[PDB]
Symmetry: C3
Subunit: 307 residues, 3 copies
């Protein structure tokens, strides 16, 4: 019942040996085993990667072929190669969010200056910049521990209008469209076809047929329940500029412009109120703010009733 | 009706599908017959002649064509035609709704847009490994619509982050799109506007009207395409699900959906949809009573 | 009175307009005399000498200059001076409002920022066709302010999407700007902050304060600049049109405008502006009554 994983990768190391990134063209799941990354011998390097190995004197970096193995996906990432493999498994949809331990990545990953000449270390970057500029403009896409998903894999059946907004480790199921205002973090994303125009925080999962409206916030700052991760089930709709700090079951809706936090008091059809966290995971709910009273209300959506 | 025509440089995928077409100089014409033809050698402009070739790593080819649209009222027949329509809008030769922009999702190819040019989704991972021999491979987006500025930069405009303006967006002189603004195709401004929020496809904003940061026009669950008239202001993080006339204001943080019940000065309420298109209105949520209300300006 | 100086690599348009200047190592100096001069050959640093030249396709030239600002309290006189000011802020040599950042819009050239370097608006469509001989032509933006990280990467910082930080933003160590974060010029953080919403020009956020996803901070109090003190939290999709002192919270989804009438624990109401700069406040919209309320935090009671 323990599953492992393995992949041949092209890793870029900084001048001090720090792992900046690793691209695995064909990761795969394997029987449980022993975690380690090794340098591949010449005869084991796929021909497509052999042409990509080298040293960049201006960036002071080297690109090397490795094989990374994870003994158990339940274990925490040991090092950055292991971290990059786990992120690739998610974005390749070989594992769904929470199907592997995605804990502790901030601590294991290197902060990288991502440029139009490849990953660079922070250390010595201003001298690197001046050297690279002999080649043409130096553009820095971002400075962060997580790069852009699409620079490692483009999953099929998917559209991403502005790929700055999908981190490697995001899981986008076939039929998903991420629009310009959409954002998907690592260990997060969609299980089926969703229009994603709002923000899916790390660990958040959105079920098949559910749409996230423009500017909508799922599990944002001050949204509530610190501890447990929230998810939304199937056929849910979050209105534009809405927010959500509790899980939703199937067939729920949050009105445009409404932020439902776990601690928000919600008035029910019977006139009683509960904290929204008491509704977390329920189905068939519509949340709105009454435009006459200003009260946050929840209504049943199927003609049946809340519970 | 009016037709259009233009000479374009198209990129075809390995299977012949049209990935994109750049038309440096589209123009309007008398009505005629829709068709795209490959240009003969003597008809290729000299600026474009150096750009034609085949890319063996991407498995694509770039070719010079002339696309004619017989009538701007017809639906786009093919991707060349679709690209020509989007160029007419961004060139401001045609205003939103000034041509038929329906059916494009169905006509346009889903494209992997890269720092090496457009690529097909099919065989992309093998293409990526081959291109990496040239340097890093960066994918800007995977979608049916590219970035307007990569085809035309219209005059009198600023766009702080050009990832946020689709080809097909119409931005009148004096318009500034800030980093949080977004303008879809067949949509945009007719005059000078500060755009820091989201203009959905089909939506037009009149001269002098400003869209505050994070504002949503016609977003999901907001409520016939809507439009904003002249000298309006949508507050930051606000939303609009109805049309506004001239001189309207929506308070920061308020979402006026078509189904929102609004209290008028006399204490009577109405659904906001009944006010659609009115001028001189201020919408706010009263911070004391909690009620969405409208005031005269 | 403090001045500043820097050797820079300037790119000029075909008509001589300054498109940008990159200053690798700006420095503060004694009060002095403002001027930009072309460096003689012997004064060009070896790393910049290799970068000087003329681009015939773009119709631009890159030149080595030294720019001196006589007094940081004076308004920028021209684009070289403006770019130096912006670099002083982003290098954290000056904090926001530590130099006069007025009139920059009027001084700076509107630039087509491309993967081939800065280009002029003038004649750009022909330039694009020539540059496509080299490969794809990607336009990042068309604006007077370029992306900070293309001039300096400050240490101790993360920026998930660097399209969203203008040159002139001041990001103190421990700062993370996430994809939804935005930081304008003459604005930013004084210490460690998680920034996932929008910091307008002139706006400063104190050590340990976090700006939630999609939150909106207005630049001024509808003419006093808005700031946030230490340990404040703005919830996702919230908005702030008044200053906050320390240890304040604005609830997710609530926009506090200067004119909003807020009800207080004693049930009297004030305009929110009357609370501007106070500490220990929590603003929320009551989910039963619809009213915007302010609560005292941590038994601290409330000061106007
Ligand atoms: O007390 P009142 O009955 O005057 O107020 P109320 O019944 O709560 O609201 C009046 C009507 O407006 C509706 N209403 C309230 N807030 C709304 C919102 N955000 N979107 C759409 N409809 C809304 C109520 O369902 C009700 O419909 P009905 O009157 O149609 O039930
Ligand atoms: C609703 C308005 C438009 C009101 O404008 P005014 O100029 O009247 O402001 P004012 O003088 O403060 O308000 C007039 C009177 O109404 C009262 N008042 C105001 N709002 C109220 C409310 N919701 N309920 C009850 N009373 C209210 C005030 O106390 C004052 O009372 P007295 O009668 O007693 O005097 C404003 O508060 C607003 O929302 N503006 C938003 C601006 C905005 O977002 N601009 C977009 C660019 S900014 C941006 O994009 C942000 C950065 C970013 O997001 O990136
Ligand atoms: O309302 P109170 O008078 O209880 O205020 P408080 O106790 O100081 O604030 C904490 C309580 O307010 C609730 N609460 C949170 N957000 C709210 C909102 N927007 N409107 C009304 N109540 C709200 C929390 O669930 C919490 O419940 P408890 O008071 O039940 O913890
Ligand atoms: Mg069910
Ligand atoms: Mg970008
Ligand atoms: Mg946004
Ligand atoms: Mg610190
Ligand atoms: Mg204090
Ligand atoms: Na399905
Ligand atoms: Na971007």
């Amino acid at each position: 019942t323990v599953t492992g994983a393995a992949g041949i990768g092209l890793a870029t190391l900084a001048a001090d040996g720090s792992v900046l990134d690793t691209w695995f063209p064909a990761p795969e799941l394997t029987e449980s085993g022993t975690s380690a990354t090794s340098r591949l011998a010449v005869s084991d390097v796929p021909v497509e990667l052999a042409a990509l190995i080298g040293r960049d004197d201006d960036r002071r970096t080297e690109t090397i072929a490795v094989r990374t193995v994870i003994g158990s996906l339940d274990d925490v990432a040991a090092d950055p190669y292991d971290a990059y493999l786990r992120l690739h498994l998610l974005s390749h949809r070989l594992v769904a969010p929470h199907g592997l331990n995605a804990g502790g990545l901030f601590g294991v990953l290197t902060n990288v200056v991502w440029t139009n000449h490849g990953p660079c270390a922070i250390d010595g970057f201003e001298a690197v910049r001046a050297r690279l500029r002999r080649r043409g403009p130096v553009t820095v896409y971002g400075v962060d521990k997580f790069p852009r998903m699409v620079d490692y894999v483009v999953p099929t059946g998917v559209r991403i209008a502005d790929a700055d907004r999908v981190r490697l480790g995001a899981h986008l199921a076939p039929g998903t469209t991420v629009m310009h205002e959409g954002f998907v973090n690592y260990n997060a994303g969609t299980l089926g076809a969703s229009m994603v125009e709002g923000r899916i925080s790390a660990g958040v999962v959105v079920g098949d047929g559910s749409d996230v409206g423009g500017g909508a916030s799922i599990m944002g700052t001050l949204s509530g329940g610190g501890t447990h991760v929230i998810s939304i089930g199937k056929r849910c709709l979050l209105g534009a500029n809405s927010g959500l700090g509790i899980s939703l079951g199937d067939d729920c809706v949050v009105e445009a412009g409404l932020y439902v936090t776990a601690g928000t008091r919600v008035t029910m059809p019977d006139s009683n109120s509960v904290k929204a966290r008491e509704l977390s995971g329920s189905s068939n709910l519509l949340f709105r703010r009454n435009s006459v009273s200003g009260a946050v209300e929840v209504l049943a959506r199927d003609g049946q009733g809340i519970a």
